C-alpha cells in the first residue's frame, strides 16, 4: 500500500475545506447580524462556500476512487478555481454596489 | 569462491558488459557437445567450437581496438589542450582554476577509462586461456598452438597501458602545479580474522597493492603506522570528538614505519559543521623528530620549523603561511590546554588503489592495538618524552602490562568511494561491503575507542560500539535495543537534524499560534464587548488560550534547544492534541451552561 | 692475461687439447705486428680465411674431446646402473667397487667441467676480439654457437647430468647397505628461484599470465617533509676488488659467496635513501635449501667515502647514537653494530671498492602477507663502468664512491659515457621465487609450470645481474676477468619462439624434459535537491508568517473599528494599539528572517536555520496582552470580582 | 540504547535515523481539523453570546458539529499515532468521516437559513 | 501523471486564497457594519484582497500550464510574498492612521 497519493489528496481536500469553512462561517456571521443587504450578501457568500464545499467533496471522492483505479484523479481544475474566484468577485462587487446604492 | 563468469559479470560497468568473452556460453557449448556425442569429440565439433571461439575473439579484438583508438584520441586532445592552457597563463586572461579543474576532471576520466580497458583486456585473455585449457583437457584434441597463433594475430592484450597512465598522471601533475595560485562516501567495517584472507583476496582481484618500499618488498615494519593522541587530564578533546561539536579538535603525532623514522607528522583534525552538513578538516605538517619535544614545550619557534622551507624557496608563500599558521595554532593549543600523550594507536595498513584512479580506495588495518601513554594514574609511562620508548612497532607488545594495552580483536576495512554524479559504485565493491565478510560500523574511531577502553574509569560517556565488543560478528555465507550502557557511563550518540526540520519545527508553531489567536480572538471578544454573563464563558476560553500558548512556547523552545546541542528530539506530541480538545470542549460547555443557567435558574 | 691462467691450470694428461689461445691471439695481432710501418690492408681475405680455419680446428679438437669423454663417462655410469635392477644382483653389489667408480666418475666430471669452463671462456674471448678488431669481416660467433649446439648437453650454468647421476647412484648405494658409509666427496623452509629472459614483444602477454594469479605491487612514496615520478629507477652500484674475487666465487658456485652493493632510487641530487647491502646464498651438503641472508645498512652520502675507503668507524657511532636518541631498543642497536662491524671488516679484508653500476625498473607481483610466490621483472637494464682499475686514467676518482660524470645537473649526463663504458641488456629479466616451506610437492602452482615451459620466456639457470654486468663490461679485457658465464652465447640470438611451434618445436624440449622427469620419478620409485527543498521550505514558512500577520491584522482592525461600541472603550483602544504593533512586528520580522534565511541558503554557510526570538516574543506578548485584557475586564475599570465573587446568580 | 537498532542481516547495533515527517503529517492533519473545530466553535459561541433568539437556537447547530469534528480529530490522530508507532498505515478510515461532517455542517447552514428567513 | 505536484499547486493557490478570505472578510465586515471612515478602510482592504486573489489565480494558471508542459521549476516564486508583505504593511498603516485622524 502506497497512500502517499491518498495523503496528498486528503491534504488538498483539507485545504479546500479550510477555505470553505472559513467562507461559510463568515457568511453565517453576516446573516445573523446584518441587514437586508447584509443578508443578501451573506446568502451569496454562503452559496459560494457551500458550492465549493460540495465541489471539493465530490472531487475528493472521485480523485480517491480514480487513484484506487489508476493512480491519478481528474485534473480539469483549470475551471473550478476559476469559477470560484469569479463568483467571489461577483459577490463582493454586488455587496459593494448594494451598499453604494443604499 | 566464485566462477569466472560471475567475476566477468561483476567487473563490468555496463559499458564493457556485452563485449566480455562469453565464457559461460563456450563452456556450455563444449559440455553439451561432449555429452551429445557420448563423451567423444570429432572434427566437425572442433570446427564448430573454433568458429565460436573465433567469433568471440573477433568481437573482443574489435571492441578493444575501438576503445584503444578512442583513448589515444582523447589523450592527444587533452595533452594539446593542457599545453594550450599552460601557454595561456602568459596572456591577458589566465585560464583560471575553473579551466584547470576541468582539465583535471577530464584527465581523471581518461585514467579511469585506461584502467578499465586494461582490466577488460586482461580478463578476456584469462578467459581465452581458461577455455583453451578446458578444451584440450576434456577432449583428445590439442587446440593450444592454433589458438595461440590466432590470439597473436589478433592481439587485444599486447597493449602497454602503463605508459598511458604515466602520461596522464604527468599531465595531471602539470595541471595541478600550473593551476595552483562527485560524491565521496567513506565507510568503516569490522572484519573478523577468519574472514581476513578471503576478503583480501577479493580486493586483490580488482585493485593493486601500494608498497612503501623501494625494492617492492613486503617488509614487516614498512606497513606499520603509529599515532600518539593528545588529551588533557579531563579528556576535553575526547568528549569534543565524541560529542561532535563545532571546532572539535583531535591532535596527533603520527609516523610510518619502524622507530628509526625521523619525520613525525603533527596532525590536527577539526570538525566543522553547517546546516548543509558535517565535515572534517585535516591539517598536518612534518617535523623532524629531534625537535618534537621542544616543539611541544614552545622552545622550538614556528619560524624555526619552516626556516629551511623558506630558505630553499621551492614552496609557494601561501602554503608556507598556511603551514605557519597551522603550526602556531597547534603549539598554542598544546601550551594552553596542557595537552599530554594519552593513547598510541598502532596498526599495519595495506592500501589497495589503482594508480591515479580515486574511484575506489581500500585500506585494511590489521594488528590494531592501543597502548596507554598518559600518567593519569600516577605512573610515568612517557619519561618526559612525546612517546613511549618502552615499545616500538614490535607487535603484539608482549612486554606491556595487560592494563596498558587494548588489542582490538578485528581488523578495520576503510572503503573510500569517489563516484561522479551519473554513475554508481562498481558491483564488486557493492557486494564486498554487503557480504558476510564485513560488519559495517560507521564512525568508528581508534582514538575514541582507545580512550574509552583504556581510560574507562575516567570516562563517563562511551561510544555505541563499546558495550558490543563481545558480539560475535561472524555471519553465515549468503532489531536490537538491548544494548544498555554500563552503570555510570551513558552511551553518547550525537543526533544530526535534517535542514528541513528547522522549518517544520517552526511550521507547527505557527499552526498552533494562529489557533491560539483565534481562541484569543474569542476570549477578548467576550470580555471587552461581551455582557457580564458572557465573561463566564470567556473564563473558559481564556484558560484554553493561555494553555495552548504556553504549551506551544514550551514545546517549540524545547525543540529548538534540543535540535541544537544534538539531543534526541521527541517528535510525537501526546499532550497537546488531547489537552486542547478537552479544554475547548469544556470551555464550550461552560459557556453553554452559563447561558442555560441564566435562562432557567 | 688468461694465457698465464691457462698455462698454470694445465691438466698435464689433457695438455695437448687445450685451446691454443695465445696462437689465435697472435694471428689476430699479426695485422698490427706484421707490417708495423705499412697499415695498408693488413687484414686481407687470406688472413681471415686462415683465422677461420684455425678457429675451426680448435673448436673441432676441444669439443670432440669434450663429447668423447662425456660419452665415455656416460658409458661408465651405464655400466654402474646395469646393477640397479635384478634385486638378486643388487644384493651382490660390491660397495667398494661402486664407491671407487663413483669417485673416479665425479673427479672426471669436475675435471671436464673445468675443461669446458676455461676453454669456453677462451673461445668467447677470441670470438669477441675478432669481432671487435674486424667489423668489416663476418662474425665468427656463428661457428662457436653452431658447435655449441652440436653438444648432447646444454651449457646453461646448471649442474651437468653427470653430477645428478652421481648423486642418484650414491643415494642408491647408501640405500643398499651404507655400512662402510662413503667417501667425503659425495655430494647430495626450502625455496627455489627461476630466472628467465623475456623479449619485449612478449612482456605484455607474460605480465597478463602473472596478473591472473598475483596482484601487481605499486610503489607508493613514503610521506616526508614535502607531504604536508610514477615509477623510480633502481640503481645498484656493485663493489668488487682488483682480482674480481667476488665475481669469480659467485660464478664458481662457491657456497657463501657474497655480493656487496649500494642501492638507491632516483638521482643522488634528490638525496635519496642509500642502502649498503651484503647478500649471501648458502648451500650446504647436509641442507636442502638455498638459505639467503641479507645485511643492509642505511648509509648517508656524507659518510660513505670514509666508511668504505678510509676505514673510519665514525658513521657507526653516529648512526647508533642517533637511533638511540630516537628510542631504538638496545637489541636493535646491538644488531646494527654487529652488521656495521661485519660489513666494514668484509670490505677491509677483501679490499672492495665500487666497480659497476646497474640501473633498471622493477615490477613486482606478490600477494600481501603470502610469501609462497613472488615474481619480479627488471627492465631497461643498463650497466655503467665505475671501476678505478685504470691507474693512468681512472674512470672515477679512487677516493670517491661514485662517478661525478653521470651524477650532475646536466639533463643528459649519459652523453658523458664513451665506447666500452656502458652496455644495455636487451631482454627483461624475470625471477620467480617459490617458498616451499612444506616438504611436500608443489601445491597447485601449475601456472608457474606453464610459464616456465612456455614460448614466452627463456630460462637461464643461475643468472645474475652482477655477473652479466661484469661479463659485458669487463669480460673482453683479459687483465681483469678470466672466466665468463655460460649464457653469454645466447644474447646474440633471437630468444623468441613460434607460438604454433610451442607445441611443434617448443613442445619438443617441453616433452623431452617431461619424459625425463617422469622417468626419473619412475626409477626413483622403483629404487542540489537539498537546496531546492530548503528554499521551498523557506518560501512556505514566510507564507505562514504572512498568514499569522493577516490574522492579527484582522483582529486589530475588528476591535479598532468597534472600540466605540465596546463596553469598555479604553481597554478596546489599548488592545487595538497592542495588536497593531504586533501585526507590524510580525510583518517586518517575517520579511527580515525570510531575507536572512535566503542569504543563508544561497550562501551555503551557517550552523542553524532557526530564529526563535521572534516566535518567542510574539507568543509572550500575546500571553501578556490576553492576561492584561482579562485583568482590566475584571478589575478597577470593570470591577466585579476581586477574588472569587461571581456565582450562578447573574 | 539511544536509538540503537540492529539491521536485519547484521550483528552490530548502529544508531538509527528517525523520520519526523511521519509525525509531522499527523500533527498537520490534526491541526487542520482543529482549525475547523476552532472556527466553528467561535461561530457557535458568538451566535450564543450575541445573537437573538434565532441565533441562540442556531448556535447549537454549529457547536454540535464542532464537537463532532473535535472528537473525530482526536480519535483519528490518536489512532494514526498508534499505527505509526508500530507499523504505520491506515488511510482507509477517513472517507465517511469527512463526508458526514460536511453533511452535518451543510444541514446546520441550511437550518440556520430556514430559521432566519422563515422568522 | 504526477498527482502530487498538481495537489501542491492547488494547495498553494488555496494558501493564497486564505489571505484573500481573511482580508476580504475584514473588508466586507467593515463595509456592512462600519461608519463612513471605516467604509473606505473596507474598500482598501477589499482591494488588497482582490489583488491577492487575482495574483493567486494568475500564478495558479501559469504554474498549471508549466507543470502540464515541462514539469517542476518553482524557483521563480519570490516576488509575490514580498509584494504581499509590503501591501499588507502599507494598507495596515494607512488604515490605522486614517481611522486615528478622524
Ligand atoms: C474563531 C472565530 C472567531 C475569530 C475569527 C477572527 C479572528 C480574529 C478575532 C477577531 C475578533 C473580533 C473582535 C470583535 C469584533 C467586533 C465585534 C463587535 O463589535 O461586537 C459588538 C456587538 C455588541 O453586541 P451587544 O449589543 O449584544 O452588546 C451588549 C452591550 N450593550 C448593551 C452595551 C450594547 O456584538 C455583536 O453584535 C457581534 C459580536 C460577535 C460577532 C459574531 C461572531 C461571528 C463569527 C464570525 C465573525 C468573526 C469576527 C468576530 C469574531 C467574534 C468571535 C466571538
Ligand atoms: C474575497 C472574500 C469575500 C469576503 C469573505 C466573506 C466576508 C463575510 C463578512 C463577514 C462579516 C462578519 C461580521 C461579524 C458580525 C459583525 C459584528 C457586528 O455586529 O458589528 C459591530 C460593529 C457595529 O455594530 P452595529 O451593528 O451597531 O453598527 C451600526 C451601523 N449599521 C447600522 C450600519 C449597521 O461593526 C464593526 O465595526 C465590526 C467590524 C467588522 C468585523 C469584521 C470581522 C471579519 C473577521 C474575518 C476573520 C475570519 C477569520 C476566520 C473566521 C471563521 C468564521 C468564524
Ligand atoms: O569454473 P571455471 O571458472 O570454469 O574454472 C574451474 C577451475 O577454476 P576456478 O575454481 O577458479 O573457477 C579450474 O580452472 P583452471 O584453473 O584450469 O583455469 C578448472 O580446474 P582444472 O585446473 O583441473 O582444469 C575447472 O575445474 P575442472 O576442470 O576440474 O572441472 C573449472 O571448473 P568447471 O570445469 O567445473 O567449470
Ligand atoms: O578520509 P579523511 O577525510 O581523511 O577522514 C579520515 C579518514 O577516515 P574517514 O574518511 O572514514 O573519515 C582516516 O582514515 P585514514 O586517512 O588513516 O585512512 C580516519 O582515521 P581513523 O579511523 O583512525 O579515525 C580519520 O583520519 P585520521 O587517521 O587522520 O585520524 C578520518 O577523520 P574522521 O575522524 O572524521 O573520521
Ligand atoms: O649534512 P647534510 O648533507 O647537509 O644534511 C644535514 C643533516 O641532515 P640529516 O640529519 O637528515 O642527516 C643535518 O643533521 P645532522 O645529521 O648533520 O646532525 C640537518 O641539520 P638539522 O636537521 O638540525 O637542521 C640538515 O641541516 P644542516 O645543513 O644545517 O646540517 C641537513 O642539511 P641538508 O638540508 O642539506 O640535507
Residue numbers in the entry:
A (entry chain C), E (entry chain B): 55 to 156
B (entry chain D): 1 to 181, 195 to 491, 602 to 724
C (entry chain E): 31 to 218, 232 to 271, 320 to 618, 722 to 844
D (entry chain A): 38 to 156
Quote the passages of the study that discuss this structure, keeping the authors' original sentences.
A 3D reconstructed density map of this InsP6-activated VTC complex was refined at an overall resolution of 3.0 Å. Our cryo-EM structure reveals that the TM region contains fifteen trans-membrane helices, wherein the TM domain of each subunit comprises three trans-membrane helices. The exit tunnel of the catalytic TTMVtc4 domain is positioned at the entrance of the trans-membrane channel. TTMVtc4 and TMVtc4 are connected by a well-defined loop (residues 472–618, named TTMVtc4-TMVtc4 connection hereafter), and this loop interacts with the N-terminus of one Vtc1 protomer (Vtc1A, including residues 1–21) at the membrane-proximal region. In the structure of our InsP6-activated VTC complex, a molecule of InsP6 (InsP6A) is bound to SPXVtc4 receptor. A second InsP6B molecule binds simultaneously to TTMVtc3 and TTMVtc4, likely promoting the association of the two tunnel domains. A third InsP6C appears in the positively charged tunnel domain of TTMVtc4, in a binding site that is normally occupied by the ATP substrate. Our complex structure reveals that the interior wall of the upper translocation channel is positively charged by a series of basic residues in TM1s, including K24 and R31 of TM1Vtc1, K694, K698, R705, and R709 of TM1Vtc3, and K622 and R629 of TM1Vtc4.
The vacuolar transporter chaperone (VTC) complex is the only known polyP polymerase in eukaryotic cells. Subunit Vtc1 harbors a trans-membrane (TM) domain, Vtc4, Vtc3, and Vtc2 contain additional cytoplasmic SPX (SYG1/Pho81/XPR1) and TTM (triphosphate tunnel metalloenzyme) domains. The SPX domains are receptors for cytosolic PP-InsP, and PP-InsP binding stimulates VTC-catalyzed polyP synthesis.
